UniProtKB/Swiss-Prot annotation, chain A:
Keyword Nucleotide-binding: no
Protein name: Large ribosomal subunit protein uL16
Organism field: Oryctolagus cuniculus
UniProt gene name: RPL10
Quaternary state and interactors: Component of the large ribosomal subunit. Mature ribosomes consist of a small (40S) and a large (60S) subunit. The 40S subunit contains about 33 different proteins and 1 molecule of RNA (18S). The 60S subunit contains about 49 different proteins and 3 molecules of RNA (28S, 5.8S and 5S).
GO cellular component assignments: cytosolic large ribosomal subunit
Cross-link Glycyl lysine isopeptide (Lys-Gly) (interchain with G-Cter in ubiquitin), where in sequence: K178
Ribonucleoprotein keyword on record: yes
UniProtKB/Swiss-Prot annotation, chain B:
Membership in a protein family: Belongs to the universal ribosomal protein uL5 family.
N6-acetyllysine modification, residue list: K44, K77
Keyword tags: Acetylation, Cytoplasm, Isopeptide bond, Nucleus, Phosphoprotein, Ribonucleoprotein, Ribosomal protein, RNA-binding, rRNA-binding, Ubl conjugation
Protein species of origin: Oryctolagus cuniculus (Rabbit)
A Gene Ontology BP annotation from the UniProt entry: translation
UniProt GO molecular function: rRNA binding; structural constituent of ribosome
Full protein name: Large ribosomal subunit protein uL5
Role: Component of the ribosome, a large ribonucleoprotein complex responsible for the synthesis of proteins in the cell. The small ribosomal subunit (SSU) binds messenger RNAs (mRNAs) and translates the encoded message by selecting cognate aminoacyl-transfer RNA (tRNA) molecules. The large subunit (LSU) contains the ribosomal catalytic site termed the peptidyl transferase center (PTC), which catalyzes the formation of peptide bonds, thereby polymerizing the amino acids delivered by tRNAs into a polypeptide chain.
Cross-link (Glycyl lysine isopeptide (Lys-Gly) (interchain with G-Cter in SUMO2)): K30, K44, K146
Swiss-Prot record, chain C:
Protein family according to the UniProt entry: Belongs to the universal ribosomal protein uL18 family.
Gene Ontology biological process: ribosomal large subunit assembly; translation
This protein's encoding gene: RPL5
Sites of the Glycyl lysine isopeptide (Lys-Gly) (interchain with G-Cter in SUMO1) crosslink: K218
Entry-annotated residues carrying Phosphoserine: S183, S270
CDD domains associated with the record: Ribosomal_L18_L5e
Protein name: Large ribosomal subunit protein uL18
Compositional bias ranges of the Basic residues kind: 256-266
Curated annotation (Swiss-Prot), chain D:
InterPro entries from the UniProt entry: Ribosomal_eL21, Ribosomal_eL21_CS, Ribosomal_eL21_sf, Translation_prot_SH3-like_sf
Biased composition (Basic and acidic residues): 111-122, 135-144
Record-level Gene Ontology MF annotations: structural constituent of ribosome
Residue span of region Disordered: 111-144
Protein family per UniProt: Belongs to the eukaryotic ribosomal protein eL21 family.
GO biological process assignments: translation
Keywords, comma-separated and alphabetical: Cytoplasm, Endoplasmic reticulum, Ribonucleoprotein, Ribosomal protein
Protein name: Large ribosomal subunit protein eL21
Subunit-level organization: Component of the large ribosomal subunit.
RNA sequence: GGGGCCGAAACGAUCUCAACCUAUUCUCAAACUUUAAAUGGGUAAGAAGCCCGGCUCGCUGGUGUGGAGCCGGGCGUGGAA
RNA sequence: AAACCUCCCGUGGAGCAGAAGGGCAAAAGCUCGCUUGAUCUUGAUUUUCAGUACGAAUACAGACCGUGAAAGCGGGGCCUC
RNA sequence: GUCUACGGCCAUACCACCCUGAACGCGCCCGAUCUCGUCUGAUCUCGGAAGCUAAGCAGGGUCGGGCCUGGUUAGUACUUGGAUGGGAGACCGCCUGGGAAUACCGGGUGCUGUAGGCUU
C-alpha cells in the first residue's frame, strides 16, 4: 500500500535524512547491502563489474531490494552459490513524505513514507566481482537488474582489480614488490612515509 | 651509580569508609587521628545512589595523607600485619602499590566497645627527587619518560627494602 | 583493549596555547589588565614594576609595551649587590628591598631626578608615597607585577615594592601585604616590617641555631660563616649597603672580549644526510637476513 | 516571518576560525587609533560587550571618537532608500586597520619624491597610474625544435 | 561475557562465538564541517591632501611628553579608465 | 557496574538556570573571602525602524561605592527574549 | 653560538621515544624559627646552597604522527552572462569569462624585540 515510483523519481527537494529532527521514520526495506562469498580475498574475484546510472533521479529502497534479489537469484544459478561477491553502493538516507487525506492544505506538511537513495550521473549503483570466466554471466544478470530500476542505466565492466581503487593490469607487481597487502575484501596501501620499523616488519 | 634516582615515598594516603554517615563516621575519625597525629578530613558523596543507600552531598568517608618519616613508620607497621606479603596486582601501572586491612587493633590501637572494628585502606605513592615539577605553580611539566616509576621497578624496590616475598598472581 | 585518546584526529583538533603559556611563565589573563593602556592616551607608556624572585637571584625590571615587544628601559638584579657590599643572602627579603631600591635609584639617574624625590632615608616601614612637586618634573609611576607569585602577607615581591617606593617611585599600594600587618586584629605594625627590611628575621634564626646545636648552624648558614656574617653586624651592613646604592646607582657594562667562535651545541642535520641514513639502514637490514639465511 | 533578534544568523559570522580559539592576542588590544583612520569591522566571538551589529560586519568606517577602551566610528549603511552615515560605538577586538588606504598613502609619498625630483630637470614623467596596456609586440623564438603537436584524447568511460 | 569441551579448580590449556580495540573499506547530512569557489558587499584612487614653524589646553602626562584645536607659509605635475 | 582514596591520560568531548546557536581552561566552569555597580543624574548611539516610540543594549561624563596589593573590573545575570 | 627576565607572531613552536649539555644561568635539592597556609613545608610562603644533570629546560634525531607550504587531483566539480541548442522529461552539450576541495606524492620542523649574562 504505497504510491508508485513516478511521484518520487526526481530529486525535487533538499536532502532530508533520518536524524534528530526527522524522527518516526519507518525502517528501510533494504537491510543487507552485500552478500555472496563476501569472506573472500582480492586474488580470486578480479572482475569488478559495475552498474552505472545515467540520470539524476531517486532510487527507492524497495527498488534496490528488487534488483538485489533478481541479480543474486540468477548469479547463484549461473556460477554457483559462493562464486561471486556483490554490493549495492546506494544507501537510502533521503526520506520522502506524504500529505495523507482522510481540509485541503491548511497546515499540510508531510509524514515519512520510507527511505530513498539520491544518485548522480555516472555514480556506481551495483558492483559485482567474480572470476574471468563469468564475464557474460555478470553482464546479462545486471541487465535483469536494470528492469527493477526506473530510468536508464548502462553496463560498464571496470578496469579495477576487485572492489579496490587500483588498476587491474598493475595490481600484481605491487603485491610482488610489497607495496600492497590484501586484507579480506580490500587491500592495504603502504606508503614510504611511516616508521622504518614498519618497513622492517615486511621485506623479511 | 645514579645520583638521585633513588625511589623514596612521596606520601601515604589513609582513608576509612564507614559507608553512610554520622556517629559511625565520627567515631572512626579518632582511629585515624591517633594513628597519625593530625586532624583527619572528611569526604562528601559525589551523587545519589539508592543501591548503596547514599544520597547527594553526604559525609561518607574520612581520609588523611601522611608525609615525611611518619609515613614510613606507618608503612612499616602495616607490613607487619600483611606478613611482608603483597600480590602482583597490588602494584599499579604508575609504579605505586597499596593494600587494605580489616582490623585497626593490631596497629597498636587499644580496643574500645563504642569505637568498634574499622578497617583501613593503605596506598603508597613512590617518588624520585624531582617529582614536584608536575604540581608546583609556575613552570609545570611532565616528569620525564625514563624518570617515571614502572610496575617492574616498584616490585624490586620493595624486595630490597623489606625482603619482599610477594607471591605471583 | 580500550580506545586511544591521542589519535590522528586528536592532534588535528588540538589547538596549542601561547608559547609563554605552554612554558608557564606569562599569566595572560592578568596581563591584559596590567599592561594595556586607555585608547584616549595615544601611546602614553604604562610602566610596570616587574619582580621575579628566582632560586638564587631577584630580578627587578621596568617595562612598557611596544608592538614588537615590551621595552625594558631599566633593570636591576640581586647579584649586583656584592658591588654595594652584600656578600651573602641575595635571595632574602632584605636583598629584595635593596634590588627594589637599586632599580628606583637607577631609573631616576637616567631621567635626571637623583636630587628630586629622595624618598625614605631613615626607612621605618610605614606607609610612604611620592608626592609630585609643583614646578618640577612629575614623579615616576609604575605598577607592580607579581606574575604567578602567590601574593600573601610578607612576600618578597612586596619587599621590592617597598624599596622602589622608598627609592622615589609613586606606586599605588597598601600595607596589607607587608610583613607586620596582623591578620586577625587588622592593624599594621611598622616595627615588624623594619625587622624584615634590615634582616633581623634572619638574625633571630641564626642566633637561634647557634644556641641549640652548632652543626645545623654550619649546614644552614654556610657562606654566612665563610663571609664572616654575624647577627650583630648585619643591620649596619645593610644600612651601608642601602647607603652605597644612593650615590652611585648607575650600572657599568662588562667589557666584551673577542669571541672564540666555536660551536658547543650540536648542529641540525641536513636533508641529504637524512636520505642517506634510511638507505643505509635498509641496506644493513637487507644484508642481515641474507647472512642469517 | 523571521524574528527580529540582535544576533540572528550569526552562527558562522561571530565565530572564531578553526584552531584560533582561547585567549585573544594582545596586539589587537594595544593598537593605536587616531581620528580619521580608515577602519574595517570584523566581529570577534570571544568578547561580547561592545559587539557591533551584524549589518556592519565586513564594512569599513572612519574614526570620529576615541574613548578609554572603545572607539566610535562613522560607517556607511544603506537601508532601502539611501546610505546612512551613522555613528556606532564598538570595542577594540572588532577593530582592525584597513590597508586599502595604505596603498594610496605610499603612492603619494613616492609621487612627491618623484615630483621634487626631475623638477630641476623638467621631464614629464608619467605620474598617474595606467591600466594594463596592449602587450607591446615582441619576437618569440623556438630553439630549433618544432612546436609539438597536441591531440584530443579518445573517449573512454572512466566511471 | 554467553554456549561447550580437558579440567575438583587455576588469565592452565582449548576450537570458537559475542561485544570492544587497531589499521581499512561503501554511502551520506537545509537545522554537520577541516577546506572552499563563481557571482557579490564596503572602502581608497589628493587641494576637504601633504610638508613645515609656532601658540592654547582646566584632558593625559619621567620628558615645551602624547592628543586635539588655532594660526602663518609652501607645494597645481587636477594624481586609474 | 556505579559508595571512598591515590597515580596517569584528558582542547574541553562536562559545566556556564532554562529552548537552541555562538563563546569560555591557572575562565566566563568548581570552591572560599568581602560586598550590594541590581545606587543617583545629564546627554549620545545601536537593535525593529518611518530611521517614531516601548523594551533591550552599547560607549562615555559627573558623583558615592564594592573588591583587589595594584593595574583594573563592576552602574545586574557570558551574548542573543 | 648560547642562556636568563619580560614579550610579539601563536604548532615550522605541539605530541611520543632516544641521545648530548663546556661556562654563566635556569632548576632539581636542604630545612621550617620568623612572614604565610594547609590533614600533612606534597602545594604556597620564608630561611638557605652539601650534592646534580637524574628530571624540568636547551639542542639534535625518528623512511614518526601532527602542523605549514607546494605538485597532483583539475581546468575536473562548480559558476556570471547568452542562444528560436539538444532531450518527452530528468538532465546534458556549446560560446563567454572566473575557478575549487579529497585521497596520493614532495620540501621544512620556529623567527624575532629590549634589558642582562657565559663562551672572559
Amino acid at each position: 500500500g504505497r504510491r508508485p515510483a513516478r511521484c518520487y523519481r526526481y530529486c525535487k527537494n533538499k536532502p532530508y535524512p533520518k536524524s534528530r529532527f526527522c524522527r518516526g521514520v519507518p525502517d528501510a526495506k533494504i537491510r543487507i547491502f552485500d552478500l555472496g562469498r563476501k569472506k573472500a580475498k582480492v586474488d580470486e574475484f578480479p572482475l569488478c563489474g559495475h552498474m552505472v546510472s545515467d540520470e539524476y533521479e531517486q532510487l527507492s529502497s524497495e527498488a534496490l531490494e528488487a534488483a538485489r534479489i533478481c541479480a543474486n537469484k540468477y548469479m547463484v544459478k549461473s556460477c554457483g552459490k559462493d562464486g561471486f561477491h556483490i554490493r549495492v553502493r546506494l544507501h537510502p538516507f533521503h526520506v520522502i513524505r506524504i500529505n495523507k487525506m482522510l481540509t485541503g492544505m491548511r497546515g499540510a506538511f508531510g509524514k515519512p513514507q520510507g527511505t530513498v537513495a539520491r544518485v548522480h550521473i555516472g555514480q556506481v549503483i551495483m558492483s559485482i566481482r567474480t572470476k574471468l570466466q563469468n564475464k557474460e554471466h555478470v553482464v546479462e544478470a545486471l541487465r535483469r537488474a536494470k528492469f527493477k530500476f526506473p530510468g536508464r542505466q548502462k553496463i560498464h565492466i571496470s578496469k579495477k582489480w576487485g572492489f579496490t581503487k587500483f588498476n587491474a593490469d598493475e595490481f600484481e607487481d605491487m603485491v610482488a614488490e610489497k607495496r600492497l597487502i590484501p586484507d579480506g575484501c580490500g587491500v592495504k596501501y603502504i606508503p614510504n612515509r611511516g616508521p622504518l620499523d614498519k618497513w622492517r616488519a615486511l621485506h623479511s | 651509580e645514579n645520583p638521585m634516582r633513588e625511589l623514596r615515598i612521596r606520601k601515604l594516603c589513609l582513608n576509612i569508609c564507614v559507608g553512610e554517615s554520622g556517629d559511625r563516621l565520627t567515631r572512626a575519625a579518632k582511629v585515624l587521628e591517633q594513628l597519625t597525629g593530625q586532624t583527619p578530613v572528611f569526604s562528601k558523596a559525589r551523587y545519589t545512589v539508592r543501591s548503596f543507600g547514599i544520597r547527594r552531598n553526604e559525609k561518607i568517608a574520612v581520609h588523611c595523607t601522611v608525609r615525611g618519616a611518619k609515613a614510613e613508620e606507618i608503612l612499616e607497621k602495616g607490613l607487619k600485619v600483611r606478613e611482608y606479603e603483597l600480590r602482583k596486582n597490588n602494584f599499579s601501572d604508575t609504579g605505586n602499590f597499596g593494600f587494605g586491612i580489616q582490623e585497626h587493633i593490631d596497629l597498636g590501637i587499644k580496643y574500645d566497645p563504642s569505637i568498634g572494628i574499622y578497617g583501613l585502606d593503605f596506598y603508597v605513592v613512590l617518588g624520585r627527587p624531582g617529582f614536584s615539577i608536575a604540581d608546583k605553580k609556575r613552570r609545570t611539566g611532565c616528569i620525564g619518560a625514563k624518570h617515571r616509576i614502572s610496575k617492574e621497578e616498584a616490585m624490586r624496590w620493595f624486595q630490597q627494602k623489606y625482603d619482599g616475598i610477594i607471591l605471583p598472581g | 583493549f580500550v580506545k586511544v585518546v591521542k589519535n590522528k584526529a586528536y592532534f588535528k583538533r588540538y589547538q596549542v596555547k601561547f608559547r609563554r603559556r605552554r612554558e608557564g611563565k606569562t599569566d595572560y589573563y592578568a596581563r591584559k589588565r596590567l599592561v594595556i593602556q586607555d585608547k584616549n592616551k595615544y601611546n602614553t607608556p604604562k610602566y610596570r614594576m616587574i619582580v621575579r624572585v628566582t632560586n638564587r637571584d631577584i630580578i627587578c625590571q621596568i617595562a612598557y609595551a611596544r608592538i614588537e615587544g615590551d621595552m625594558i628601559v631599566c633593570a636591576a638584579y640581586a647579584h649586583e649587590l656584592p658591588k654595594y657590599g652584600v656578600k651573602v643572602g641575595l635571595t632574602n627579603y632584605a636583598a629584595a628591598y635593596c634590588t627594589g631600591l637599586l632599580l628606583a635609584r637607577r631609573l631616576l639617574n637616567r631621567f635626571g631626578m637623583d636630587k628630586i624625590y629622595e624618598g625614605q632615608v631613615e626607612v621605618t616601614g610605614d606607609e610612604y608615597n611620592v608626592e609630585s612637586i609643583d614646578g618640577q618634573p612629575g614623579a615616576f609611576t609604575c605598577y607592580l607585577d607579581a606574575g604567578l607569585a602567590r601574593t600573601t602577607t610578607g612576600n618578597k615581591v612586596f619587599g621590592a615594592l617597598k624599596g622602589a617606593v622608598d627609592g622615589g617611585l609613586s606606586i599605588p599600594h597598601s600595607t596589607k601585604r607587608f610583613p607586620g600587618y596582623d591578620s586577625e586584629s587588622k592593624e599594621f605594625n611598622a616595627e615588624v616590617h623594619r625587622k624584615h627590611i634590615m634582616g633581623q628575621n634572619v638574625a633571630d634564626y641564626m642566633r637561634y641555631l647557634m644556641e641549640e646545636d652548632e652543626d645545623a648552624y654550619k649546614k644552614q648558614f654556610s657562606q654566612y660563616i665563610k663571609n664572616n656574617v654575624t647577627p650583630d653586624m648585619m643591620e649596619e651592613m645593610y644600612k651601608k649597603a642601602h647607603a652605597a646604592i644612593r650615590e652611585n646607582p648607575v650600572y657599568e657594562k662588562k667589557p666584551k672580549r673577542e669571541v672564540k667562535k666555536k660551536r658547543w651545541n650540536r648542529p641540525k642535520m641536513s636533508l641529504a644526510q637524512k636520505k642517506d641514513r634510511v638507505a643505509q639502514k635498509k641496506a644493513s637490514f637487507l644484508r642481515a637476513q641474507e647472512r642469517a639465511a | 516571518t523571521n524574528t527580529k533578534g540582535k544576533r540572528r544568523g550569526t552562527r558562522y559570522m561571530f565565530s572564531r576560525p578553526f584552531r584560533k580559539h582561547g585567549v585573544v592576542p594582545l596586539a589587537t588590544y594595544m593598537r593605536i587609533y587616531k581620528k580619521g583612520d580608515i577602519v574595517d569591522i570584523k566581529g570577534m566571538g570571544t568578547v561580547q560587550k561592545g559587539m557591533p551589529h551584524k549589518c556592519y560586519h565586513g564594512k569599513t568606517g572612519r574614526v570620529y571618537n576615541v574613548t578609554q577602551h572603545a572607539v566610535g566610528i562613522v560607517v556607511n549603511k544603506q537601508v532601502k532608500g539611501k546610505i546612512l552615515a551613522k555613528r556606532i560605538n564598538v570595542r577594540i577586538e572588532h577593530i582592525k586597520h584597513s590597508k586599502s588606504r595604505d596603498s594610496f598613502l605610499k603612492r603619494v609619498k613616492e609621487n612627491d619624491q618623484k615630483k621634487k625630483e626631475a623638477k630641476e630637470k623638467g621631464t614629464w614623467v608619467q605620474l598617474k597610474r595606467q591600466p594594463a596596456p596592449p602587450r607591446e609586440a615582441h619576437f618569440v623564438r623556438t630553439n630549433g625544435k618544432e612546436p609539438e603537436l597536441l591531440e584530443p584524447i579518445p573517449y573512454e568511460f572512466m566511471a
